[PDB]
Amino acid sequence: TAAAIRAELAKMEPFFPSGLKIVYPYDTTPFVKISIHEVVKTLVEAIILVFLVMYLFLQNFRATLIPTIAVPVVLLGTFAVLAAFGFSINTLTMFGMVLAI
Amino acid sequence: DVITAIKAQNAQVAAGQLGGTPPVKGQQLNASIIAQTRLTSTEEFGKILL
Amino acid sequence: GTGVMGGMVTATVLAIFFVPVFFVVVRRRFSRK
Amino acid sequence: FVPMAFFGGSTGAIYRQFSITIVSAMALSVLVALILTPALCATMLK
Amino acid sequence: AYLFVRLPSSFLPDEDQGVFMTMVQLPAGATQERTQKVLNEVTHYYLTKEKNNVESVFAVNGFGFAGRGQNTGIAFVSLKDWADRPGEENKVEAITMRATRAFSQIKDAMVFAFNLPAIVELGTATGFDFELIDQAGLGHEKLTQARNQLLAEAAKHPDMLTSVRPNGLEDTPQFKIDIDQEKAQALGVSINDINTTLGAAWGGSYVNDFIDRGRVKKVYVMSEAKYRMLPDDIGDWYVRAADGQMVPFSAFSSSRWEYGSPRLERYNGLPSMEILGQAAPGKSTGEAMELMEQLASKLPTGVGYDWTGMSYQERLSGNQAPSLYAISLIVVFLCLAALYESWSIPFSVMLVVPLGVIGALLAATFRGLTNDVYFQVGLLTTIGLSAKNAILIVEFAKDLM
Amino acid sequence: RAFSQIKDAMVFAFNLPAIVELGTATGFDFELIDQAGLGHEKLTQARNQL
Amino acid sequence: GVGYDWTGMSYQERLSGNQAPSLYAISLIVVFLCLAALYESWSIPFSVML
Amino acid sequence: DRPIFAWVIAIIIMLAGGLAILKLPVAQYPTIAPPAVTISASYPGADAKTVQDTVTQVIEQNMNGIDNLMYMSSNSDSTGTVQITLTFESGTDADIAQVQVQNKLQLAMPLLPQEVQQQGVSVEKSSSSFLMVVGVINTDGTMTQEDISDYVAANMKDAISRTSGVGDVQLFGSQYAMRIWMNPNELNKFQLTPV
Amino acid sequence: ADAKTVQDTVTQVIEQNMNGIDNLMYMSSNSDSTGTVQITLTFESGTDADIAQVQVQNKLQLAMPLLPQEVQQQGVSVEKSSSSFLMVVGVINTDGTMTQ
Residue E254: φ, ψ to 5° = -145, 95
Residues whose CB falls within 8 Å of the CB of residue H90, separated by 6 or more in sequence, listed in order: D9, D10, D12, H31, H32, H33, H34, H35
Find, among E153, E137, E136, E116, the residue nearest to E275 by Cα: E153
Using CA atoms, how far residue H67 sits from E290, G5, H62, H124, in Å, is: 31, 41, 14, 16
Q: How far apart are CA B35 and CA E175, in angstroms?
A: 9
Give the chain B residue whose CA is nearest to the CA of H179. B22
CB pairs under 8 A between A and H: 127
Cβ contacts of I26 on chain G, cutoff 8 Å = 5, 7
Q: Among the residues of E200-313, which ranges form H helices?
A: 290-295
- Count how many residues are written for chain C: 33
Give the chain D residue whose CA is nearest to the CA of E319. D8
- Count how many residues are written for chain A: 101
Beta-strand runs (E) in chain A: 21-27
- Same topology, domains E17-121 and E122-171+269-317? Answer is yes
Kindly compute the dihedral angle of the four CA atoms of residues H91, H97, H98, H99, in this order, to the nearest 10 degrees.
150
Contact D11, E123 (CB under 8 A): yes
E380 membership: H or E segment, kind and range: helix E375-389
Residues whose CB falls within 8 Å of the CB of residue G4, separated by 6 or more in sequence, listed in order: F30, F31, F32, F33
Number of Cβ atoms within 10 Å of the Cβ of I100:
4
Q: How far apart are CA E218 and CA E211, in angstroms?
A: 9
Phi-psi region of E280 (alpha: psi -120 to 50; beta: other; left: phi over 0): left
Q: Among the residues of C1-33, which ranges form H helices?
A: 2-9
Q: Does E209 sit within 8 Å of I66, measured CB to CB? A: yes
Q: How far apart are CA E360 and CA E370, in angstroms?
A: 10
Q: How far apart are CA E46 and CA E61, in angstroms?
A: 17
Please count the helices (runs of H) and the strands (runs of E) in chain F. Answer: 1, 1
Probe site for chain H from D17, D30, D36 (most H CB atoms < 10 A): D36
Q: How far apart are CA H75 and CA H126, in angstroms?
A: 15
Report, in angstroms and rounded to the nearest whole number, the Rg of chain I calculated over CA atoms. 17
Q: How was this model experimentally determined?
A: X-ray
Contact I63, I13 (CB under 8 A): yes
Q: How far apart are CA E132 and CA E196, in angstroms?
A: 37
The CATH class of I1-81 is: alpha beta
* Pairing mode, strands E205-212 and E215-221: antiparallel
Contact H71, E308 (CB under 8 A): yes
- DSSP string covering D1-46, please? -GGGGS--SSS-TTSSSSSSHHHHHHHHHHHHHHHSSSHHHHSS--
Sign for the CA dihedral angle at E120, E5, E94, E100 comes to positive
Q: How far apart are CA E189 and CA H105, in angstroms?
A: 37
Residue E44: φ, ψ to 5° = -125, -50
Q: Does H1 sit within 8 Å of D39, measured CB to CB? A: yes
How far away is chain F from the Cα of G15, in angstroms, using its nearest Cα?
A: 8
Number of Cβ atoms within 10 Å of the Cβ of H24:
7
Q: How many CA atoms lie within 13 A of I40 on its CB side?
A: 10
Residue type present at position A70: A
Residues whose CB falls within 8 Å of the CB of residue I2, separated by 6 or more in sequence, listed in order: I33, I35
Contact E85, E19 (CB under 8 A): no
Contact H83, E66 (CB under 8 A): no
- Count how many residues are written for chain H: 195
Cβ contacts of F43 on chain G, cutoff 8 Å = 2
For chain E, list the contacting chains (3+ Cβ pairs, <8 Å): A, B, C, D, F, H, I
- DSSP string covering H43-84, please? -TT--HHHHIIIIIHHHHTT--S-SS--EEE--EETTSEEEE
Give the closest of C4, C24, C29 to E381, CB-based: C4
Q: Which residues of A26-44 are buried (b: 16+ CB within 10 A; e: fewer)?
A: bbbbeebeeebeebeeebe
I70 membership: H or E segment, kind and range: helix I69-72
Q: Among the residues of H106-168, which ranges form H helices?
A: 114-117, 145-154
Find, among E117, E94, E120, the residue nearest to E12 by Cα: E117
Strand partners, E272: E133
Cβ contacts of I61 on chain H, cutoff 8 Å = 102, 105-106, 109
- Count how many residues are written for chain I: 100
Residues whose CB falls within 8 Å of the CB of residue I87, separated by 6 or more in sequence, listed in order: none
Q: How far apart are CA C25 and CA C28, in angstroms?
A: 6
Contact E78, E56 (CB under 8 A): yes
How far away is chain I from the Cα of G35, in angstroms, using its nearest Cα?
A: 36
Phi-psi region of H50 (alpha: psi -120 to 50; beta: other; left: phi over 0): alpha
CB pairs under 8 A between A and G: 3
Using CA atoms, how far residue B11 sits from B35, E191, E254, in Å, is: 10, 10, 17
CB pairs under 8 A between F and I: 6
Q: How far apart are CA H40 and CA H170, in angstroms?
A: 12
In three-state form (DSSP H/G/I as H, E/B as E, the rest C), the secondary structure along A37-50 is: HHHHHHHHHHHHHH
How far away is chain E from the Cα of D33, in angstroms, using its nearest Cα?
A: 15
Residue type present at position F7: K
Give the closest of C6, C19, C21 to E359, CB-based: C6
Q: Does E377 sit within 8 Å of A96, measured CB to CB? A: yes
* Pairing mode, strands H71-73 and H81-87: antiparallel
Residue type present at position E144: T
Resolution, expressed in angstroms to one decimal: 3.7
Q: Does A25 sit within 8 Å of E58, measured CB to CB? A: yes
The CATH class of E17-121 is: alpha beta
Q: How far apart are CA I49 and CA I22, in angstroms?
A: 11
Q: How far apart are CA B43 and CA B47, in angstroms?
A: 7
Would you call H26 exposed, middle or buried from its count of C-beta atoms within 10 A (0-12, 13-18, 19+)? middle
Give the closest of G3, G9, G14 to F33, CB-based: G3
**CATH code of the domain made up of E122-171+269-317:** 3.30.70.1440
Q: Which residues of C1-33 are buried (b: 16+ CB within 10 A; e: fewer)?
A: ebbbebbbbbbeeebeeeebbbbbbeebbeeee
Angle between helix H96-105 and helix I51-60 axes, rounded to 10 deg: 40
Would you call E177 exposed, middle or buried from its count of C-beta atoms within 10 A (0-12, 13-18, 19+)? buried
Kindly compute the dihedral angle of the four CA atoms of residues F31, F36, F40, F45, in this order, to the nearest 10 degrees.
-70
- Window 25-84 of H: residues touching D by CB (8 A cutoff) are 30-34
- DSSP string covering E115-174, please? ---SSSSS--SS-B-EEEEE-S---SHHHHHHHHHHHHSTTS-TTT----EESS------
Q: How many CA atoms lie within 13 A of H119 on its CB side?
A: 21
Strand partners, E9: E371
Using CA atoms, how far residue E345 sits from C15, C22, H176, in Å, is: 16, 12, 78
Residue type present at position H121: V
Q: Does G2 sit within 8 Å of F35, measured CB to CB? A: yes
User: In angstroms, how far apart are the furthest CA atoms of chain H?
Assistant: 105
Reduce the DSSP state of residue H3 to 3 states and report it: coil
G27 membership: H or E segment, kind and range: helix G21-31
Q: How far apart are CA E248 and CA E270, in angstroms?
A: 40
Contact E55, E145 (CB under 8 A): no
- CA E117 from centroid of its chain's CA atoms: 11
**CATH code of the domain made up of H32-126:** 3.30.70.1430
Reduce the DSSP state of residue I82 to 3 states and report it: coil
Contact H73, E167 (CB under 8 A): no
Residues whose CB falls within 8 Å of the CB of residue E100, separated by 6 or more in sequence, listed in order: E112, E113
Find, among I45, I54, I62, the residue nearest to I79 by Cα: I54
B18 membership: H or E segment, kind and range: strand B17-18
Residue E264: φ, ψ to 5° = -100, 135
Is I58 in CB contact (< 8 Å) with chain E? no
Reduce the DSSP state of residue E400 to 3 states and report it: coil
The CATH class of E172-260 is: alpha beta
Q: Does H15 sit within 8 Å of G26, measured CB to CB? A: yes
Q: How many CA atoms lie within 13 A of E59 on its CB side?
A: 17
